[PDB]
Amino acid sequence: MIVPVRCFSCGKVVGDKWESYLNLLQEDELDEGTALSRLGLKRYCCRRMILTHVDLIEKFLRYNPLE
Amino acid sequence: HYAKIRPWRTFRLNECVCTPYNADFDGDEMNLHVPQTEEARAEAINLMGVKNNLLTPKSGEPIIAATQDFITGSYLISHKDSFYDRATLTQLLSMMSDGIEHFDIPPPAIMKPYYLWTGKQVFSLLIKPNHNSPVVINLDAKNKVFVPPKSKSLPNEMSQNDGFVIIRGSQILSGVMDKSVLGDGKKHSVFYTILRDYGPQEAANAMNRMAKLCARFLGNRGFSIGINDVTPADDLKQKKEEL
Amino acid sequence: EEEPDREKIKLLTQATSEDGTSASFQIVEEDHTLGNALRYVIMKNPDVEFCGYSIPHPSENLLNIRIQTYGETTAVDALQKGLKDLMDLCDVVESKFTEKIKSM
Amino acid sequence: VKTAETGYMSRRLMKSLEDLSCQYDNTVRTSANGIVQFTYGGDGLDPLE
Amino acid sequence: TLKYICAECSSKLSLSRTDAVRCKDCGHRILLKARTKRLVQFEAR
Amino acid sequence: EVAVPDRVAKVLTYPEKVTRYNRHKLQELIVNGPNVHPGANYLLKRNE
Amino acid sequence: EIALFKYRKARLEPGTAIGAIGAQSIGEPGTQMTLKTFHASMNVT
Amino acid sequence: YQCAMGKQAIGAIAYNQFKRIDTLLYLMTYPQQPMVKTKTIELIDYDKLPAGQNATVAVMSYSGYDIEDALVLNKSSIDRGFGRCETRRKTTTVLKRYANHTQDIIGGMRVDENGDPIWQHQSLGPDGLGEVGMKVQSGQIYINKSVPTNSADAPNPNNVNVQTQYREAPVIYRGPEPSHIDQVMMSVSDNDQALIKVLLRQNRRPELGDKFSSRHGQKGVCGIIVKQEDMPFNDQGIVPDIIMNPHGFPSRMTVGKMIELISGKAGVLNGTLEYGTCFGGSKLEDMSKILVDQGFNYSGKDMLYSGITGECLQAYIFFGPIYYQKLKHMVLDKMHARARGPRAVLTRQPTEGRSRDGGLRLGEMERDCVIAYGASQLLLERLMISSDAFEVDVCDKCGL
Amino acid sequence: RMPIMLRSNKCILYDADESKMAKLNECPLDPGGYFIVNGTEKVILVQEQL
Amino acid sequence: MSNIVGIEYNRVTNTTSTDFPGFSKDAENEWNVEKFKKDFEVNISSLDAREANFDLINIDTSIANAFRRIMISEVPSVAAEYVYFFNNTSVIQDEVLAHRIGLVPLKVDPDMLTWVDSNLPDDEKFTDENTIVLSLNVKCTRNPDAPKGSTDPKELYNNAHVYARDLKFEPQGRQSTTFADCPVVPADPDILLAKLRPGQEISLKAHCILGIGGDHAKFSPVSTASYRLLPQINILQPIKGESARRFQKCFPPGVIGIDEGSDEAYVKDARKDTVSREVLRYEEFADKVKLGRVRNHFIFNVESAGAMTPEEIFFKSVRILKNKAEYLKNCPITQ
Amino acid sequence: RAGVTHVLSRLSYISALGMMTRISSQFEKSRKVSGPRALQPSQFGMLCTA
């Protein structure tokens, strides 16, 4: 689904760092670890949720009751 | 055994009485029946309760005793070097027997070069805490890992790694406890001796007393398995192929 | 509404031995926060010889401290000496912190 | 494969030993008042204690 | 009350009783009821 | 001691008949209700 | 006194259903082992 | 033991997961990919629809509630949404016409006049079938149905009265916890038999009694739930999500989990997801070079403090990210109890199984045990008084 | 009538990609290989013999 | 007894407090005004508007634990609790979107509120300054151009991604002159709350309550609060060889270094070195370098969620421990 | 023959691939002898060993 707003163990707002992360990996392509460390995700518990994150809400919007 | 009304909806009980059920907290569920008449309720607790059935019938060995986090917390208090101050000892004796207990602290193991109790004196207050507690048990027991001594010395306890349990008047004079001194399946144990001499009530009371200490201190101390203790230290790695 | 919380500290009468010198107390609604921070201060009273908190069950909201002391002191008075003393500790930490945050 | 076969084995071993208790004259007897041992185990002692 | 969204054309159409249930625009079989006007509360927990 | 939850104990019920020691306890308990936990569900009369 | 008290509480109590105890005493299927020999033949159950 | 458990955990079943009315399916709110991708789960597309969440585990003996195979969880991590569930159930009914051209008509909404509506009809809607987000709880009717009480058999159609003879027979939501309705749907069969498929769903929080996996054959129920001002912290502030007991490692010999923690910890610090395939994958030799480059230990064991007393632990704790799964068999569905319910028709016994009513069974291999105690008055209760006691008139001579 | 199992030669899911699976309301990632009769979906477990 | 906690290759030692009277023969140092005031310094490091760094020296681990344990549990904060939905016709389930509104940090001071009374009925405690209302309202329409690109719906559809800044604020009949200078906008407006499709719409009035972090973790003002003992690297046997440049490889590029030539191997402040014990496993080296941390020096490195500045968080953490000793000293003991 | 067509198990993504690709059980019911039940060295490339 959508990225969770807050990390499970540490507990800081990380769900604000997905749209700015996705336009930083597609445009002007960095690496993975340098992109995750650019946005300020130092410790490994706050990094493993932007890193992992199966993209699933975009797959569920192929159907709609609008057609 | 007696009921207790609690939060979240699951049955929950101790871990010493877990070996006759062959339970392992895996997801295995157990059923629970209540008596309805006085005639069967007064005999369900008297000759069928837990505190009377501490043994097994097939051998005469205590069947409800130590579990996994019960002797590994009991071993780390007794490895000849766990030396405790006053402030650590009072916290251990307070977390051991949570509510009402007097303790009448013994003299320490070492005097004026700083006052440091041993671990055997912390552990012997679990058996006979008061001056009114009549538990004056004494025994002489082996352990599993017993290497023999130098074969010229007389007693069976001059060996290399703690050897041989000598209790003389509810005080431990030598040795870790270590499985068949309180360890589910052999005789000559501590909780078999209290049950054999000073009733079943004191044996069930002194075994509830161990579970609190081994539940709080074993998490307070820290104990883990890493990856650097499964690796050979290059001599086995040099020797195993050529052998 | 001026009732000074009778549901707070209860002197356990089955634990007090002499009527003094050894007592077990019982809070309501605390945790490990005021446990260690108070038994550190009570242990610095040079007339006590046993102090330690204990939560019997985490599903409840309780804690039991036990004070044992030497002669010429009351175990109730050893709590009150160690509970006013934590106030001065939190007052001197608050004072030294606010005198340096206004300087930088 | 083993537990069902020994579940049938411990089942049938119950029924031939079921009503067999020690009486007040230190003799174990069957249901039809027939005697099997004049004292338990030749010794008359509790195997638990 | 302008309910029963169709499942294929996604048309909001109300049907009368003693009639065959279908969509009058195309003829699709299955159709699902609209979300209520009422209020519902939830805790953020 | 086994520890049962607070919902199994609402539907597991023991017949405690009243005689001179139960009376002051099973009267404060019968006004307490089947919903509040120190309470009771049913009541069988003297004439049954 | 202790050695006669432990023998006082050692004889069998009258009324124990000890046939039912001994029926599920010997019924302990926790062996699951197949023994053999070496330096071979002559298997035995 | 994992192959019988990978096909058992909850997950992210399909893309049309919300447009289907399966009779029972489990969902999961925030799924996560595994950190250690096997080189064959990329072929079968398991990284598209995963079935669990990464958890910063800390293998240590802690709190005593983890003695035998029962891991303890963080309160403030489930509180932020670690492993949220959604059980989704179908309770469909059909309505059909009879032989004499008399079908059944759904309806209701008794406004009760100082009322509006009855508590039984509280969330039902003016049509007769429930709404798309109202709440039902253990008493409410949502699929209200009324059959004709005369045309169930086959008489001739008497024209003086045909329709207006009805018998109210709905089915009532009978569950322990309140659920919500979101997929009420009307359709038609081939022979003009109209059917209504209703779909119930409820959010299930991970609480005390739910079991978890490790992708390595490690079952375990929840030990307790415990706060965040508890379980210990490192120099950066990481508190663990789940604490496992190290005693499940030696006799189970599962050292592949003990490579999984250090291969997943370096996978975060480098950024790239690393591999854990059979007979190869990512070597341990060029694994822990990433650990010493970042500033961590070679073995993945950093010193922790204590949350209950402050001072540092006496040993080194082996903690890092390990992917855990959440299975079926929640304690909300396994909970079961009965005092005095319906009996059997033939043998007057308490009824069999679940969802009729309870009443549990004392086997033949259980009465063997209570004879060995010698308690004779407990066999009169637990076999005659409680289960089946029936007074009877017998005769003295020629006794029948 | 002869029910046809999904993703066969005589099926509608044959040669579908990213636009026809969403219009016909089905996930393009399921394995298929199953029959569906009377609403429920059913497989045929492959039997071995000698 | 040797205040420096020792670090070996498989264990630690000298952990406990060892600063209480009745320990060897002479009592020390029971309270002694003003010896605790004489030996308490604080040094505030680089302090931002969201993150503060400062260390407390010469205290034990019991009063530094209690500040940390209060700082994320017992301090009060404010977050949305009850959400009232109107036409949630989106893909997200109705409790999942209600769970995401609770976990946003709302930038407002929890001193301009009062506590809730959990005994009244429904329309008796959502009055003045006890409850804040937040209203969200958004509908997705089709962007009529859509020239050539099929991308994420910022070009194909208007406002398909809803954010945390859509949580608008409506003041009540009294809190319009008290919340005039500062709104109740969230701490981070760019939080992806939901994404959706045209034909879908969400609208809700979420109430907002004050609470502590022991009930629910959304009432915690701190991301994480912890301490760190600073290590020290006691150097002895000052031989350097070629191994001095090998000795700076096993540490981070901060803490140590060499001067002109080599001649020795010195050390800077050890505030950068995570204890990694890489120099404790070389079989020829464990007789000249010992590692260890200092027990009485706690480097607090606290952060914030955005509601309050962290020095206010620490000041409120110290002050509420003094209040829970007031409330225990001024109460009678009922036997 | 009974018990050859089962309903498709839909719990996760891999349970639908465990009902798929699944060879069944034929005769030689093997109550006590573990002849046709134990694992054999002949099933190397096929008939997964775990």
Ligand SMILES: [Mg+2]
């Ligand atoms: Mg099991």
Ligand SMILES: [Zn+2]
């Ligand atoms: Zn984090």
Ligand SMILES: [Zn+2]
């Ligand atoms: Zn249509």
Ligand SMILES: [Zn+2]
């Ligand atoms: Zn007759």
